[PDB]
Amino acid sequence: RLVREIAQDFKTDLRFQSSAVMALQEASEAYLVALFEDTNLCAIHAKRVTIMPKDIQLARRIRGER
Amino acid sequence: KKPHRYRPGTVALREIRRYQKSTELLIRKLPFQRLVREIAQDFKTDLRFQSSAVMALQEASEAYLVALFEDTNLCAIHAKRVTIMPKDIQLARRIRGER
Amino acid sequence: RDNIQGITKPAIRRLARRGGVKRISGLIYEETRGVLKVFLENVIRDAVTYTEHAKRKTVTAMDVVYALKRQGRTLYGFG
Amino acid sequence: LRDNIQGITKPAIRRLARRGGVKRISGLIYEETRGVLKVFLENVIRDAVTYTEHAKRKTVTAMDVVYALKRQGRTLYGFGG
Amino acid sequence: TRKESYAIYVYKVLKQVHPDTGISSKAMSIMNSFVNDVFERIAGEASRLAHYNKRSTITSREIQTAVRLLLPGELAKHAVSEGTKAVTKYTSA
Amino acid sequence: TRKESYAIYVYKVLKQVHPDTGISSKAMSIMNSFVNDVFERIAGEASRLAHYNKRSTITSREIQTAVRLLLPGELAKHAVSEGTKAVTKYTSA
Amino acid sequence: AKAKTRSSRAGLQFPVGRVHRLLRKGNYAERVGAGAPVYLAAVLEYLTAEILELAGNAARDNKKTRIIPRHLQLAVRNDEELNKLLGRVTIAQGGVLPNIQSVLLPK
DNA sequence: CTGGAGAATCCCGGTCTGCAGGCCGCTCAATTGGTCGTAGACAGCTCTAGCACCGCTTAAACGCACGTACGCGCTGTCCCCCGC
DNA sequence: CGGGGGACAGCGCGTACGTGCGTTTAAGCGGTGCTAGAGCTGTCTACGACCAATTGAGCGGCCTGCAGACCGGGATTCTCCAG
């Protein structure tokens, strides 16, 4: 449902192969896992065991996405 | 009758402003040339060089190093510190993906 | 319409667990929602671009694979 | 050609860090930078020499260096293009 | 021998936008390298597009699609407009 | 119609190394995708190299250079060995 | 009749003929459409105009009559879209953006 | 708060110079014009899958109570990096 | 090389986390049903490749006056401190 909702600002009444949605889910989950791990490394480097959003922001900033 | 020495850190800020303004190279050319020729020696002997390659490597290296230093500074600040530790460099290169 | 809230906190928790995270702030979930949204638009835009240039009305997984490939995130297992 | 990596003087490393916006520097840093730079230089030079030899040449041209950098995803302008 | 570049066209565009502005050789070569880079990116994307669709020809349509894929937002829109306008002008004349 | 893949050759190689190990279809798809990926990477690199030298033909030498450029260390050495021996055998054959 | 350049026919500065020749020689495809090179030349001209305008603005801000690589780097990095476009590009003699973190400011 | 002092930087004439930019001859790549083969444009057909709907079922999320450990603030020490 | 100030260790705390139980929900599953659009096919036509002749645009070589660089010396500003 989220994917379809996002897929409206570009075009309307778009149909989808199920496999496309599956691939989207897989790629998104893999990306998020990698980001989670990088955030964990950042938070540990801050002598902490709890992740806070500044950790994610620093991670994405170093990755170049920001 | 005092030496009139500046406080620790203001000189650093002044020189940062100086070097965030200039664009020229910061490394002596001759040692860099010696190093690069030495490194290349192990892949192929009697290799000649166009200078333009020499300074092209120099620009690439210096830019990459500046980027790494900038990332390191952010990493160290995240540690609520002001001085960079080599662990910060390691974390930075690891996050970039180079490790 | 708040499908961005369809990503429940338990799912994000599981995701972090697979990522190897032990303790989580409460503010994290919304940040994750935002980042995921950004990623999703970035891919879907190009996917739809491909689907349009193919004069089609249905997006194929192959289009998605192309979009990921051109974004530097190669995916296998779908052709 | 031996021990030129020490030709990278500490003041140069300070200047590099300062251009990078760094204010306070550890002393245990400089050798670490030297090692990382050596790794980077080896990575680029290997491919540059590969390009030079596949052309069956005896001198390395900058144009080769540009190709090597492009292959490593670090594009440089202004050196022939 | 003789080498070709984009120097004259760069200079002309410079005089168009900033008629009273000079340029150094180094910056000029940087401009040339940038032009070549964009050329390669757009051409490779177009070629991949053609291959994906089992086509023998690269049209202006593929160029437009590749521009959309490679350019961010407003740059993409304005470039699309410019390309379309130039195409219509050339076709009419 | 019919779609080609690499399933049969991969199956044969598997039976060579592990004459008793089965495989799922999904692993087969992944293997095929990986093979294709390597193929395009190496082919594009070879073509770029050939254009670099202003040459009309892609020889096995170009593939050797491209493999050296794309593969890390021992993988590169071993693959170079395989290519050399196979080429020599075929030419002698 | 007298030859009339295709660049003039589309009213552009960039050489459409050279563009078409390179397109054919680049092995990008077997055959090249007629309108593609014009589209490409227009796009290149437009982007060149954008960056040149920004660089001229910067150089005048620095109060010099010639654009130097430093001006180029300033213009590219200051623009968000251009910086995004050239996210992986190194410019010789480009320098850096004079940015300093707040916490290092003397207080 | 607040002047002095010293150091650092800015700035404005004055001088010199390499190169940016323009001019020129030529030549080869672009143009023009015509030929011809064929890529795909297009119309038309088939039927697959994608969309929609509904009724169960039950795992999963949710809300909440609760309690504790950790992120954070604060403090003192000392050593080591900076200004020179 | 002196020294200040930054790194760091240690301690208190209070709260925002984690853990577990009762509850509600909506995901998931199986099924039915519909058709839009993907996919495939025949056709032919317009369009691009190709070649011969033409030529002037752009590239090479030359030259220069001035943008900018480099001085020097006052002017101005920033910082540090004793009061």
Residue numbers in the entry:
A (entry chain G): 69 to 134
B (entry chain K): 36 to 134
C (entry chain H): 23 to 101
D (entry chain L): 22 to 102
E (entry chain J), F (entry chain N): 29 to 121
G (entry chain I): 12 to 118
Pull verbatim passages from the article behind this deposition.
The Rpd3S histone deacetylase (HDAC) complex recognizes H3K36me3 at coding regions and suppresses transcription from cryptic promoters via its deacetylase activity in yeast. Here we solved the cryo-electron microscopy structures of Saccharomyces cerevisiae Rpd3S in its free and H3K36me3 nucleosome-bound states. We demonstrated a unique architecture of Rpd3S, in which two copies of Eaf3–Rco1 heterodimers are asymmetrically assembled with Rpd3 and Sin3 to form a catalytic core complex.
Of note, the two CHD domains of Eaf3 became visible in the presence of H3K36me3 nucleosome, with Eaf3-B CHD recognizing H3K36me3 at the DNA superhelical location (SHL) +1 site and Eaf3-A CHD bound to the H3K36me3 mark at the DNA SHL +7 site. Structural alignment revealed rotational displacement of the Rpd3S catalytic core from the close to the loose states, in which the MID domain of Rco1-A within the right arm leaves the linker DNA next to SHL +7 in the loose state. The nucleosomal DNA at SHL +2.5 is recognized by the HID-C region of Sin3 with multiple electrostatic or hydrogen bonding pairs involving residues Q937, K941, H1221, Q1222 and K1244 of Sin3 and backbone phosphates across the DNA minor groove. Upon engagement mode switch from the close to loose states, the H3K36me3 readout and SHL +2.5 DNA contacts act as anchoring sites to allow rotational displacement of Rpd3S, and the linker DNA contacts are temporally disrupted during the process, reflecting enzyme–substrate engagement dynamics. The existence of two engagement modes suggests dynamic association between the Rpd3S enzyme and its nucleosomal substrate, which may be beneficial for enzymatic turnover towards different acetylation sites occurred to histones H3 and H4 tails.
